[PDB]
Each structure stands twice: as C-alpha cells, then as structure tokens.
Design a protein around this ligand. Sequence first.
Ligand SMILES: [Ca+2]
Lengths: 368, 368
Amino acid sequence: DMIPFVDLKREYQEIKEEIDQAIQRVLERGWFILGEELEAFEKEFSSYIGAKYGIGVNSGSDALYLGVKALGIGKGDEVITVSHTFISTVDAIVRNGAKPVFVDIDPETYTIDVSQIEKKITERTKAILPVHLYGHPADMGSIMEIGEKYSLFVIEDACQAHGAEYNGKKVGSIGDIGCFSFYPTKNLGAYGDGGIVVTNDDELANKLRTLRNYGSSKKYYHEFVGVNSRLDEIQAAILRVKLKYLEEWNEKRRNIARLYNEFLESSDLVTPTEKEYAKHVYHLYVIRYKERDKLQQNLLKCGIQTQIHYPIPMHRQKAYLELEYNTSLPVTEKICNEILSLPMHPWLREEEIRRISNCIGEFLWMSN
Amino acid sequence: DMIPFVDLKREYQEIKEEIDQAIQRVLERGWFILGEELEAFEKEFSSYIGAKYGIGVNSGSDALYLGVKALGIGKGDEVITVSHTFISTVDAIVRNGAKPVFVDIDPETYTIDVSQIEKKITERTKAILPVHLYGHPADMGSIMEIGEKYSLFVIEDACQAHGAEYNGKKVGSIGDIGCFSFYPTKNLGAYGDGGIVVTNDDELANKLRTLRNYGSSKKYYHEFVGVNSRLDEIQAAILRVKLKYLEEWNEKRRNIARLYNEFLESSDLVTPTEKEYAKHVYHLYVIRYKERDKLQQNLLKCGIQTQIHYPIPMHRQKAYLELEYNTSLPVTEKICNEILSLPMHPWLREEEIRRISNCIGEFLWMSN
Ligand SMILES: [Ca+2]
C-alpha cells in the first residue's frame, strides 16, 4: 500500500523473457570480460547518442574520473563545475589532483548559471563540467561559446540524462566527452554498477580503453598507471535489451511529469521547468516548497516515499571543506533547503499519481 | 581439438541449475547493489578464510588500492613489495601517492625473498606487501617477524591463492588485511569483475565500507574522497554457490599438478615447488625452460594454449621506468625470461595432461 520511491521488480517482470535470454547467452559463451556484448553495446549506445565511440566502464563515477584523467587534467589545473550535483562529479576532479571552481545554479533549471562561468576562468582553467541535472540539459550553447573562446574542454555529466536533448541534439554528443551512469535506478539502468564514456576523438577513446584495462594497451605492457574499470559482458547484454525501450520509458516519465504538472502547477509547489531548448527526460521530478520538511512528513503519512537530491551541496561536504577554494553560492544553498523529489519512474500506476496529487492537495488545504 | 588455457564453459555446465537459481532470486528481488547476497557472501568468505570481516569491492585491483588507502598509506610513505607480480599490486601503492620499494624473489617459490627486506626499510616504510604468487604462500613467518620488529603493516596479495595455507592457516588471514580477486579465471571466479578485502580490524572494515560507497558512511554525507567499488548482488549470489566447491576444485588442481610433476619433474623443465609450510592451490602451473618462447610456439603447433605470468617485471615497465627504477633484481630478471604457464584448471582430464606431456617430450627430443 506504500508507494516506494522506486520499484525495479516491475521493470524485470515487463521484460523477463528478453533479459533471461541475454544472461543465458553470456553464461553459455563463458566469456565475461571485454567481449562481444560490450563491443556491441558500445556501438549501439554511441550510435544512439550520436558519438563515434563508446568506452564502457564500471560506473558513472569512473566515466567522469577517467574522462578527466584522459584529457590530461591534474595537479595545478582547475575545472569549473557546480556544487549542486552528486558526489562523483566533484570527486572526478579532486581524485585527479585538480581543483574544482564552483558556479551557482539557475534557480529555474537547477543547472549551471552560464552567466557566472566566465568570471571563474583563470590561467589554470582546463575544462567546464556542466551537469544535466534531473534529466534537463544545461544551456549548452552558452557553455560551448565559453569553451571555444577560452580553449577549454567541455565534459558533460549526463549520468541523469540518457536521451535528453539540447536543441534536438542528444546530450553527451556536444562536449569533448559525455559521461553516463547505468546505476540501476538511472533512466537506462543495469543490474549492477556500470557506466560509459562517449566521444568523437579516436585518440581519447584509445587512451580510455588503456586506462580502464589496468593501464595496459597491449598484452604484457603497462604504459601508465591505470585502474580496473570495465562494463561486464552480462551487464552490457542486459543494457542492449533495455536500450531498445529507453525512448518508450522516457516518454512514460514525460507523461507522468505532464500529469504531476496538471495537478501541481496551480499549487504553491514550484514544478520543474522544461526550457524551449530542452527535451527533459525526468530522471527525477523535483519540486520546491518553503516547508519541504513538513511536506515530506505529510506525504509519508499518506504512504508516499520521497527523497532529496541533495540536501547538503558539495561545497558544504566534509570531504571538501579543507581542500576547496572559498566560495559563495546563495542560490544553491537556498534551493537545497527547498527541494523534494516525488516518485518518478516508468512503472508508476494510475492509483499512484492521483493519490500523490490528492495527498499534496489535502496538505496544502490544511496548511492554508 | 585445441586444449585452451582455461574452460569457464565446463565450470558453468557442472553447477548450471544452482547458478541459474541464484541469478533468478536476485532478478526477482529487484535489489542489485549493497544487498543481502553481498552481506551473506562477505560473512561466508571471511569465515572460510578465518577473518572477522569481509568487504566486497569491484576488483582485486581495488581491494589492494582501498586496502592501502584505508591503512593511511600515501604521500611520503614507502611499501616494500616484489617486481615479479601483476600490475595492480604496484599500482595500489602508486595510486595512493606512496612509493614502492622492490625486493627480489626466491627462484624456487617465485615469492618475496624475505632475507632482502630488512636492508630496504627506511623511516618512510609503512608496510610490506607480499604476493602469494601462482597459489603458493610467501614465507609469512619471516614477514610477520619483520612487521612486528619494525612496526609495519602486512598487506597480503592473495588474489591468486584462494584457499592456500601457510603452516595450516589460510592466506589472507595472517596480515592486517587480505586482498582477493574474483576475476573469472581465478580459483574462485565471478561472472564479471569482483574482489574482497578481509580483516579482523572493525575500524578498518568500517573505513573500507565508507570508501567503496562514494566515501559516504551515511545517506547525504561525503566524509572522505572515495570511489565507487562494490561487488554486485548478482556476482555475490554466484560466488556463494561457487565457494561451496572451492576446496573440491582446488583438490582437482592439486591432482593435476601431481600428474604434471610425474611426467615433467625428471625433464629439462623446472617444475613448481611446494614448500613444507605450504598448501599450493595452483592458480597457475608454472615451469622454467631455457628456450620458453620456442617451447610456447611448439605447444601451440600441438594445439595447446600457454601464457606467461609475466614476461616484463614491474621495475622494467614503462609506467615505472619513468620514475627512477634502476633497481637490480637478477632473479626476477632471469626467471621472467624462462617461465611458462601450462593449462591448469579443475576440468582438465588425465589424458589431456598426457597429450601436453607428449608434445613437450617430442619438442625436447627435436631440440636435443
Ligand atoms: Ca562491476
């Protein structure tokens, strides 16, 4: 009777026969690492995004970390990014020995405020790392203008944005590299950890294939210090099945967002925006409210689970307090106190959306 | 007609029903990350080794890397280890900012020469990292005496040695931590990447669980810069099945080694040794021969696949030539030119070992 924030059981039941067939093929072949399923998924996913090359890795975290590393970013370099993002966006910078320089967000889109990027550029800047947060693209026209003018790499964190578009172009295909997660709750999810880097640069693609394979480019050789970060054959096989459903499942998410907007736009809750330049894929459906703690408790009393993405922004996290530059991010700090994520996934039932709307309506009545 | 180096298809067919049931349980549960299969596998595997705690991670490479990190080893520190080992043993040290200090091997066991450790200790030394190479234990009594005398951590690289014993104690249970790989060809192999750290220290176990989970100990917090390095529920479930067979499969490997020794000990090939203190589990069956490349070519003509573990020792790799590694390790340098790994896995037939023997005998005739 509780409405959980996610329920991956529903997905498996919808595609059980195709998933079981894919897994069985890999077990029968006895080839689990760096095989034909991974090569085919890399080709299929890169073709879907409109990039020449795909390089499957163990996680979105590693896609970002290895992408920063392959671009030669490290000690003495700066990367401009947001504080309003998941951990791994900033760890990708710090683990390479570079330093983040934070920019505030646009309060409408929850993405990097492109009017505040240029004032952060120094002689040490090497890249801009925009985040397509919640499934909405960052304003990539302004970001690419700045990257061209200042000769900076553009690294897209598309981990929440599989299939999102900026002026009709798939996010992840615009910057030098695009990074995605296949964590199981992502819009395209594996049944374990996974991720990918996409690029049009063959030399960068080759460097990423060496780095992910213990820093070995040919059998017996160790050209530089690398990692073990590979997308398993079994997960690649699962992802080839699910990729064929991704456009359908994103349309389901967008239809749920349309229904929530019908019930909530008129309400005191600030509903998420889709800009004219955007195709939003609603990895998360995020509202803002002055009393979001009171609203979260009331939704739970109605049997509805919610989450916050994320209540402590990265510039306030213990991991970074000593190493980070001094920064002022008033919009990020205010937003993180006001946001709440409502249930959002392709398998939410009619009985769920109207029930969530009715709970919010009754709450706002009793509050006013 | 070919005798391949490993046969993962034959493994799967032996335990297919149990494996398929384990995978189906995980898919039906819809819980893929940090679940009950991982918790149960960690308890089962740590109990098997004789350690209090198990921390499943994505790879042996990460078990070593995170183990070094959790012990506080980093910039300004030295770790004494071997050059005759896999890449990831040494990358674990360098990725943390510490410097490896190499010592030579014993030509009989291919493991660290314990008589050469003490002279390399400095004020910077924090640990010794012995490797239980090919499934034979290092001389752990000597290593633990040096660790006690000089107050050094001992980190066991047990990635090739699941179930091996040193004076009746399982390797991995002796040092401060034990690190294992579940790469598919290991004696206990997953169907994708996996690994584990074992330890008796509850504080170290807790730090490892934080580091592997994006450096997050509790929801919404990032206390430390960490990684995403987790053993997937599906792989934990598979490994719980295979762990019940590990002792039986290691006994099959030991019986194959006994048969190779009968055919080859009196031959010009140097056969592997088991010291009185050792239970060798033969992850690899490694011989020495003066013209091992010509032997490898002739075995391939007979349809027999062989491998070399490893022809370029770590002190001669490009990754660590670029830092000043003019280290002089004459045993390592000689045996890397002479070693060859013969087929070794639990499914080889006695008459396949006779075919391999016949090919070697005909080659030795034609060479002499
Ligand atoms: Ca993995």
